[PDB]
Amino acid sequence: FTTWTSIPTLAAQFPFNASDSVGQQIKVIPVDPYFFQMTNTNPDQKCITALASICQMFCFWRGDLVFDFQVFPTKYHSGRLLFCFVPGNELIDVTGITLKQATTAPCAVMDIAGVQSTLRFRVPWISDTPYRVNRYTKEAHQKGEYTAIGKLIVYCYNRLTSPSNVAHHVRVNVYLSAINLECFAPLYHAMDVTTQ
Amino acid sequence: FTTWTSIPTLAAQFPFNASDSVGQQIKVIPVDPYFFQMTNTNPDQKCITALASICQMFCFWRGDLVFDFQVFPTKYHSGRLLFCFVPGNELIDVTGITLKQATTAPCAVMDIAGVQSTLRFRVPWISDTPYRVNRYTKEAHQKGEYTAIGKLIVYCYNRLTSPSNVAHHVRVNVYLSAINLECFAPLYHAMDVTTQ
Amino acid sequence: DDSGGFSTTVSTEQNVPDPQVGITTMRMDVSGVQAPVGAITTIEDPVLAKKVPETFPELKPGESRHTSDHMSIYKFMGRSH
Amino acid sequence: DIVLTQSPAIMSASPGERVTMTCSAHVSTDYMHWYQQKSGTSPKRWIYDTSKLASTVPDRFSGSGSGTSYSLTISSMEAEDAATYYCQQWNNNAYTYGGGTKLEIKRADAAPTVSIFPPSSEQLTSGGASVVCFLNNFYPKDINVKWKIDGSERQNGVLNSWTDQDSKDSTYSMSSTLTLTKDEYERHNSYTCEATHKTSTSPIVKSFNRNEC
Amino acid sequence: GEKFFLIHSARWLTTHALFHEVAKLDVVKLLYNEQFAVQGLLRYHTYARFGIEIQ
Amino acid sequence: EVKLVESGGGLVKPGGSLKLSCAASLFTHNNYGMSWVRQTPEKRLEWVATINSTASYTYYPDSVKGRFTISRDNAKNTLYLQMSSLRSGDTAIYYCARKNDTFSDYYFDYWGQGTTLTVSSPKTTPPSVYPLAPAAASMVTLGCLVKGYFPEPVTVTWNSGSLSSGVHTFPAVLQSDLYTLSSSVTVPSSTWPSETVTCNVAHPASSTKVDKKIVPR
Amino acid sequence: GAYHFKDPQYPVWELTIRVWSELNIGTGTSAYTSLNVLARFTDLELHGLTPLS
């Protein structure tokens, strides 16, 4: 099955406007292979990633995930982003973290212009249990069993300075893949779009 | 005499506008060393290439010709051209050839932007007779004796996409030279400007 | 070459079948001291797309407890449906 | 060979809405190319291939369709589209044209202004006459103008003239000429053209007498 | 037989929305036409086995 | 910019012949096939002619085959269109058209200004222009009535271009072998009857100029 | 075993081009760009010549 899981597919989509202050939070991502939010109208369908259509058939999962951010700038914009990873679970109160407070957590910066346009971001495995359960079959919550190892935050580390005859926003695609992955205990379940 | 013939001189001139559709024919060239069309007003003179003022003194000629196209763009335009060579003689009906129909003939594409600006185009020798006669001394036509090995067509393979603060056309010069050339049977004749 | 053509730019082999054994096993730092060249890349090059990424200091996970692997088709679909 | 059709004839639209027309053939065509005939001038480059707008065309226009049905998608109607479109097929030989879709800009309802003139004396000494009725600055285009001739209506001799949409006030104007003879003119007294409006209930009766002056 | 052919073109605008399909074409069917030079071999034969290059 | 200048045209009786010329410049003609497009005033459009680079290939539709003759002049860089066996179906406006290729099909780019051909058998008639007088408000409409002309192009301009913004030029109607229009002008109440209001009438076929001053009744 | 030209079963390959991200311009920048597709065969093998056109 690793022929499907080790190939990155598109999962998310977000813009980077020129009218944001330094330290504004752009997009939050729960860290799990069950995440996907794209959809289409003609025909009526909810799109899926390749990683979500393997791990939706197992009770447990384990391994490092690889986020790939791809920007689409011109040659003439400038600015810096700050990706931050907070360890935990799928539900904590995360938007009280200020920009200076995010440097305690492991983080990395990205320069927009240049000849490279892809940042491969490998998330380590930080947990207290060896395997992390699938819960989306159930309906009620329970403290102790979870679906995530923490969340990810996308900040604005430097603003977008640009000329007049170019556009005012740069769109970023978010890919999704895995490495050193392991699953067991099969079942059947159809996923649903996580509306973040 | 090869000290004159092996040096490229300017022969033709044509613009590439931003308002042409894909598949519009820009310029046709009969393939012969007798071709030249530039002129000047002060003083009144008809310009000549170096290749035409050697081969205008011989009854027969043979060898491969080398067309050199030189563009003058900015760094910020984009588009592609399609040079096509149709074998034949100096008179066929050539403008019925569509853009898809031109790919059967030997052809080559050119990218405008970059760090190179010159395409050297070597035309092979395709004929049924070993030597091709000079006819411009005579006045009437005759089927069987000709002056060309075919014609060349310049298409528009991709359109000109540009910003606003640059110009809207790129001019292209056409050079002319020969290689492996052979002539014999001398005479005297003064050429005249081929008005295409 | 069979066709007698010419090529300097390469679009390499894509979607390698069965790339990795799906049990967490071993074949010391995996990532560490050396600066990450896999942290930044270009995804439009198929040559540079298959480079193993790293950005944080990690090490070896270990070995699983259950013997057989549940990520092979012949053991997954061996169960009837 | 084969002939094209266009399903609307004259479509009106307010600025800021969608406009959609359809060109269709009975033998399936591959690539469809459109043209725009402005009033008084020649058509130009409007649409090369199936979906490929020209150089000087704004981005809001579009084209689609394959086989039999073909459409011209306008997302936002604007004030610069006062012209006539044409579709053309481009298979084997004939390259036949469409029927012609006259796109006019919709203006709100307005009352017609009437000023009817008696014929001049130089025409009345030439053996004939032309009782001409005027209408100015009215909407819609289709209006019912009838003559009131001693209480009756005569449909013989009616000459109606029609302009296009003016590019400034977006209004329509009309002539209504009643062709007569010198001695046929001198039988009636009551001359009245009335304009049947669709929002105003009664047609506006504007009259004059022949035996005046 | 093996020579690059121009089979179809399209044009990409600003007004096309996200995930819109610009061009949808059959690769094998458009090569089978008289206007190309590969017609002269495929017209008189019946079966073929081949690979496809795209640019 | 591509320049296509048509020439010729006029009043041709049925059973005659006429040659036209679209002389273009600024671009090379031996890359371009040329054609002709017909503008009948009732139904639109119809395409009639084709000749490629050399003068060998001529493509006509079914109707105009055997009636028309086309020939290119690459030395003088011009075009021609020899029409024979004319009748009233070809009373129209003629454009010279330029062919260009798309991928599987063809395409036009530029059409010229166009001429005027009318096929019928009356004589050339100068017009008879008579005023339009009322029998009161801040806006007073005036007008000239143009009547009795067979050649179609006429020029009705108010005070040689002074009142041009308030003009309602009504089109002409063919009635009993006579065309008739009525240009109506918008005049303020202070101009009439205190100043001069006179329309120009220019009939270039018969070369007649009739100025009609609107007088109060 | 092989493709049949004069009576195809179903098309072997089907090329597709989707808009991966939208095209954005400013003022006066041209609102379009052309596209082209090139194609050729590799390793052509023929079998069984037929007389019928």
Q: Is D102 found in the same domain as D131?
A: no
Residue B7 is which amino acid? I
The verdict on F11 and F89 lying in the same domain is yes
Domains delineated in chain B = 1-196 (2.60.120.20)
d(CA B147, CA F76): 22
Does D2 share its domain with D66? Answer: yes
The overall longest dimension of chain G from CA atoms, in Å, is 61
Residues D23 and D45 in one domain: yes
Both F114 and F126 in a single domain? no
- HSE at residue F47, side-chain half, CA atoms within 13 A, is 22
F73 with F162, same domain? no
Cβ contacts of D59 on chain G, cutoff 8 Å: 25, 31
**Does A6 contact C at CB distance below 8 Å?**
yes
One-letter amino acid for residue G37 of the chain: V
Domain extent, residue D64, equals: 1-107
Phi then psi dihedrals of residue E41, to 5 deg: -105, -35
- Whether D148 and D178 map to the same domain: the answer is yes
Do F84 and F148 lie in one domain? The reply is: no
- What Rg value do the Cα atoms of chain B yield, rounded? 18
Q: What is the resolution of this structure in A?
A: 3.9
- SS3 for chain F, per residue? CCEEECCCCEECCCCCEEEECCEEECCCHHHCEEEEEEECCCCCCEEEEEECCCCCCECCCCCCCCCEECCCECCCCECCEEEECCCHHHCEEEEEEEEEECCCCEEEEEECCCEEEECCCCCCCCCEEEEECCCCCCEEEEEEEEEEECCCCCEEEECCCCCHHHEEECCCEECCCCEEEEEEEEEECCCCCCCCCEEEEEECCCCEECCEECCCC
Domain count, chain F: 2
Do D12 and D100 share a domain, yes or no? yes
- HSE-CB for A121 with a 13 A CA cutoff: 23
| CA–CA min distance F196, chain B (Å) | 49
Cβ-contact B150, B126 below 8 angstroms: yes
Domain of F152: which CATH number?
2.60.40.10
Residues D103 and D114 in one domain: no
How do beta strands A45-46 and A39-40 pair?
antiparallel
Q: Search chain D and give the residue with CA nearest F102.
A: D49
Residue A73 in tokens: 């700038």
CB contact residues (below 8 A), chain F span 64-83, against chain B:
75
Q: Other CB atoms closer than 10 Å to residue C70's CB: what's the count?
A: 18
Dist CA F64 CA F38 (whole Å): 12
DSSP strand E in chain A: where?
Answer: 9-17, 27-30, 39-40, 45-46, 58-71, 78-87, 107-111, 118-123, 132-133, 150-161, 169-186
**Domain housing F186:** 122-215
Please check whether residue D137 touches F, CB under 8 A: no
A89 is written with which tokens? 């679970």
For residues D1 and D100, state if they share a domain: yes
What CATH number is attached to the domain comprising D144?
Answer: 2.60.40.10
- Nearest neighbour of A124 by CB, restricted to C16, C23, C56: C56
Q: Which chains touch B (3 or more CB pairs under 8 A)?
A: A, D, E, F, G
Q: Could you give the residue ranges of the DSSP H alpha helices within B32-73?
A: 52-55
User: Is residue F116 domain-shared with residue F126, that is, in the same domain?
Assistant: no
Distance CA F211, CA A71 (A): 72
Residues D94, F61: C-beta atoms closer than 8 Å: yes
Same domain? For D69 and D119 the reply is: no
- The residues, ordered by sequence, that sit 6+ positions from A1 with a Cβ below 8 Å of its Cβ are A54, C22, C71, C72, C73, C76
- Considering the domain architecture, whether residues F126 and F116 belong to the same structural domain is answered as no
Total domain count, chain D:
2
Do D36 and D93 lie in a common domain? yes
The CA distance from D8 to C69, in Å, is: 67
* F98, two tokens: 């330029």
Residues F73 and F142 in one domain: no
F198–chain D nearest CA distance, Å: 15
Find the radius of gyration of the CA atoms of chain D. Answer: 23
D140 upstream amide cis, omega within 30 of 0: yes
Q: If contacts are CB pairs under 8 Å, which of residues 94-153 in chain B contact chain G?
A: none
F136 touches chain E (CB under 8 A): no
Nearest to G30 among B157, B158, B162 (CB): B162
Q: Which of F105, F121, F137 is the endpoint of a domain? A: F121
- Mark out chain D residues that contact chain B at CB-CB < 8 A: 45, 48, 55-56
Which of F106, F121, F136 is the last residue in one of the domains? F121
Name the minimum distance, in Å, from the CA of A6 to any CA of chain C.
Answer: 8
**Which of F78, F97, F121 represents a domain boundary (last residue)?**
F121
| Residue F55 phi, psi dihedral angles, 5° rounding | -90, 25
List the beta bridge partners of residue B171: B15
* F183 & F209 share domain: yes
